[PDB]
Design an enzyme around this catalytic site. Structure first.
Site, mmCIF file in Angstrom:
data_model
loop_
_atom_site.group_PDB
_atom_site.id
_atom_site.type_symbol
_atom_site.label_atom_id
_atom_site.label_comp_id
_atom_site.label_asym_id
_atom_site.label_seq_id
_atom_site.Cartn_x
_atom_site.Cartn_y
_atom_site.Cartn_z
ATOM 1 C CB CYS A 1 -0.740 -0.001 1.173
ATOM 2 S SG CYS A 1 -2.069 1.387 1.155
ATOM 3 C CB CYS B 1 0.555 1.900 4.234
ATOM 4 S SG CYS B 1 -1.030 1.150 4.412
#
Lengths: 386, 108, 301, 216
Positions: free
Chosen positions: B31, B34
């Protein structure tokens, strides 16, 4: 006031307006020229494992659709706090219509009060939902639904039981006003386990959808097809990109379903109608950085492209030639949106540190005096004999 | 320093007691946002040197624990108070630093 | 599978530093081949970068026009031989390399000590001839750049030697389709196929800036955050937010009024204020009976 | 960083839009290549909508003039050739003019297929003196610029009326920097800013295929 409705037709995107939020991520195969990747490996960033996200939230689809020259309105709820007002500002500047956005002074944007159990295994059991989960049926803007010709929503709005009833109410009202229902699955993280729970949760909204878009991984999950192809292998074998026969997707079909779109990123888009089926090849060798690796920008761009084509020629929803054109247009929109996001976010080197791709591809001088690439004094030379 | 923990280490850390708020950062390697959230959290950890604890849990490794914590996506932060009566706060998406400072002070 | 296809129809290796490739792209609509051809040609001849030696340092040399005992060539002749050495690299930055040899013998390109990011294309390229067991140490600087430019070396970075394209009619006038051929000559630092791909990528990065948001669109990596910090600053020293950041979507206007204002590209509260009361009547479907109800909402605001 | 901005905009009339745009900072030689490619894309690669055929119903006797109509048949065709349209249509559709009698026939009186819109409602078509019924069937097409008793209409598909680019060069010592200006004139069926966006996307779509790979 239908005499005041303009062109293109308004599209109502229903759900939450989150900021850089990803529902899930599945292993995926993309079309790639692996001869180039080996040659450019020291200068082009690639993930160790290619994992693709289906897309983002309903707010991002509205922003992407507005960028294509479409007319998008976002229906949802935001808090009156600073973060909720910043998101409202971001939607307005992106020219998304926010007259269907309810501002809640009592709820808080992007924050939920959970009651964590400290008795057995840890559980959460949400208590006070966030602002973007509290839209009520009384707060639905029926005027927007009257003007809108397409209603867009995703599974994220079905997770909260209070929010699920509002989604069902909005869908039923839109169908009464002759709106086309576009259901974008974008299966959230918890639903990827217990396929039986997923089927029960989405069954009612599934039968009310005229157009459905799923990823190849989502289609396999709903059809009980265990992935059998290889992942992260340096070839473009056709088994990684297989067009399933219509009989394979028939159990998901229903009476009012017009089109089923199956996406494999921008690499390949499959389409299924009652009479026709086919697939269009694309391109997924776009610049990707660690900040954009999940490819969620492409998914929003792809769906926005599909919506843009389906709404301007709604009578061509069964023409095979227009479907091929629509699929190719969606691929191009996804490629451009992914390409732009890499430039905006950049590379890793609110404290956030980013460098440009020019800086990312800049090597060190190798001018170390001890190093073997500079001119040492006459003492330590070792003149290599010819 | 932000430390990576398993599901059993976090259970031992939540059931126990502490004098500072606990921030749990559910993340995954795939991700992009993230990674941006990691940069914000290490700045926050430096600001609150000992006034708070920041830990991260890999949801790919602990999908069962991520689901039991009602994590619906990434990035996701949990702000757990050291006062047992207080309830925790779950934030979703890339939130600005000032909101984390507000959560830590006002309600944690 | 694809309707529009491209393929290399001929790829030839004339020598170590002369590569030839011919490519076809068909079928194209009328006029598209001309657009692609000229843009591709300009990108190939002017936008592809290369890497070569930018300067050389000599150890015991008064000037670059002297002679060295034991070397058949002169110092000036050495620089010309260095200028013709073809290198390949994907990274930027000023690199340095080294020539540290002892004669007699033939100094070639394979005798250069290169940093790990840089590679030689042709080993056999001649640098100097040593007729005596002497020590010769030459420092080198290497850069990757576009176009063209211790003793400086006049570097010509462009790796594409020449390019050509032709356009041919596909056939009967179904849509007046056309066939495009592209010919590329490179110096071996990259293949003609790679040059074709790099030019396409470079062209896209030249046209895509128009698809970013216009300058000064968002308030000044994450364009949402700076406006949030403005709100935090406004919350302290209670100030309220200016009318330019308040949009008509947040006013409780009737939908018919809202559509008229959006149709006229009136988006914010300040845009609405600067419009007079005669201007709004000029807009269709917005009449005098709508002024009082609109003013009252703004009166109440 | 490389950014674009609109420095001038104006709307002289419903069918005359002007826009000037800036792109900076650019490296030496880049502005010419962008300006050349953008101009060619703006003039022939952008699809416009035009009336391509007209068909006079009611069997008007196939003469050069019609009873009750001030203008000849050719003048009506010339007037129909000047009507500015915009649309998203795929393929070809039919429109219709059905006017009862005396008065002015304008673009306002055209019954349009779904996605087709009229830019200037006041554009003139025909003057009717007698109270005769006039029924004209129209053929509407969307095409690129570079691409039964029904009179053909030689339409020129150019929503962008004109386009030009200029380059300014600045320097402070050895550091060079060039600025690209692009001027766009449209006929009102599209804004100059919208034309800039479609030209860029059409150019990008032309060069994406070179990056395509094949299944193995």
């Amino acid at each position: 006031i239908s005499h005041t409705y303009g062109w293109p037709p308004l599209v109502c995107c229903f759900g939450s307006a989150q900021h850089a939020f990803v529902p899930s991520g599945r292993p995926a195969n993309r079309l790639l020229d692996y001869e180039r990747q080996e040659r450019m490996k020291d200068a082009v960033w690639a993930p160790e494992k290619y994992i693709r996200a289906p897309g983002g939230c309903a707010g991002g689809v509205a922003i992407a659709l507005a960028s294509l020259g479409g007319k998008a309105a976002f229906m949802g709820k935001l808090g009156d706090d600073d973060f909720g007002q910043a998101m409202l500002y971001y939607l307005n500047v992106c020219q998304v219509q926010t007259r269907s956005v309810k501002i809640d002074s009592k709820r808080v944007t992007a924050c939920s009060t959970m009651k964590i159990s400290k008795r057995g295994r840890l559980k959460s059991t949400c208590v006070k939902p966030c602002a973007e989960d509290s839209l009520s049926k009384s707060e639905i803007n029926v005027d927007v639904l009257k003007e809108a010709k397409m209603f867009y929503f995703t599974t994220h709005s079905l997770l909260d039981k209070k929010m699920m009833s509002t989604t069902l109410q909005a869908i039923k009202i839109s169908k009464q006003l002759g709106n086309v229902i576009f259901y974008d699955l974008n299966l959230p993280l918890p639903l990827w386990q217990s396929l039986e729970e997923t089927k029960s949760l989405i069954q009612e909204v599934w039968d009310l959808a005229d157009v459905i878009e799923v990823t190849k991984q989502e289609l396999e999950f709903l059809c009980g097809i265990e992935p059998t192809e290889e992942f992260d292998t340096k070839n473009n074998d056709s088994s990684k990109f297989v067009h399933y026969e219509p009989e394979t997707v028939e159990p998901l079909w229903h009476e009012n379903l017009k089109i089923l779109f199956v996406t494999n990123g921008t690499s390949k888009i499959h389409y299924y109608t009652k009479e026709h089926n086919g697939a269009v090849l694309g391109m997924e060798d776009v610049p990707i950085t660690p900040f954009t690796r999940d490819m969620s920008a492409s998914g929003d761009g792809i769906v926005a492209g599909l919506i843009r084509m389906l709404t301007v020629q709604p009578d061509l929803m069964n023409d095979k030639g227009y479907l091929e054109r629509t699929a190719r247009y969606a691929i191009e929109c996804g490629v451009v949106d992914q390409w732009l996001l890499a430039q905006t976010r950049g590379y890793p080197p609110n404290g956030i540190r980013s460098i440009t791709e020019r800086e990312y591809r800049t090597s060190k001088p190798y001018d170390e005096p001890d190093g073997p690439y500079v001119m040492k004094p006459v003492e330590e030379r070792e003149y290599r004999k010819l | 320093l932000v430390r990576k923990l398993s599901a059993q280490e976090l259970q031992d850390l939540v059931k126990g007691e502490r004098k500072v708020p606990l921030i749990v950062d559910f993340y995954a390697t795939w991700c992009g946002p993230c990674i941006l959230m990691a940069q914000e959290l290490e700045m926050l950890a430096v600001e609150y040197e000992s006034n708070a604890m920041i830990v991260k849990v890999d949801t790919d490794d602990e999908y069962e624990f991520a689901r039991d914590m009602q994590v619906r996506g990434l990035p996701t932060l949990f702000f757990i108070s050291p006062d047992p009566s207080k309830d925790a706060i779950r934030t979703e998406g890339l939130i600005p630093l000032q909101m984390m400072r507000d959560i830590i002070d006002n309600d944690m | 599978t694809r309707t529009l296809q491209w393929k290399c129809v001929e790829s030839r290796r004339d020598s170590k530093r002369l590569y030839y490739g011919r490519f076809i792209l068909s079928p194209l609509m009328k006029g598209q081949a001309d657009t692609i051809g000229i843009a591709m040609r300009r990108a190939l001849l002017g936008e592809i970068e290369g890497t070569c030696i930018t300067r050389a340092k000599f150890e015991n040399i008064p000037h670059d026009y002297s002679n060295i005992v034991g070397i058949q060539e002169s110092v000036h002749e050495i620089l010309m031989n260095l200028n013709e050495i073809v290198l390949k690299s994907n990274l930027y930055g000023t690199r340095n390399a080294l020539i540290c040899v002892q004669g007699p013998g033939y100094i070639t390109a394979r005798d250069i000590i290169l940093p790990p990011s840089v590679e030689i294309v042709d080993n056999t390229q001649h640098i100097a001839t040593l007729t005596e067991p002497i020590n010769l140490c030459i420092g080198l600087k290497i850069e990757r750049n576009r176009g063209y430019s211790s003793y400086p070396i006049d570097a010509v970075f462009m790796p594409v030697q020449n390019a050509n394209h032709s356009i041919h009619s596909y056939g009967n006038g179904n849509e007046k389709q056309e066939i495009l051929f592209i010919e590329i000559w490179t110096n071996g630092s990259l293949t003609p196929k790679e040059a074709l791909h790099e030019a396409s990528r470079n062209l896209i990065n030249l046209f895509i800036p128009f698809l970013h948001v216009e300058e000064e669109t968002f308030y000044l990596t994450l364009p949402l955050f700076p406006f949030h910090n403005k709100l935090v600053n406004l919350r302290q020293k209670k100030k309220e937010l200016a009318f330019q950041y308040i949009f008509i979507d947040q006013l409780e206007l009737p939908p018919r009024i809202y559509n008229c204002l959006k149709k006229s590209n009136i988006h914010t509260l300040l845009d609405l204020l600067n419009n007079s009361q005669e201007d709004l009547i000029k807009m269709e479907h917005f009449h005098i009976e709508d002024v009082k109800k609109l003013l009252d909402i703004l009166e109440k605001k």
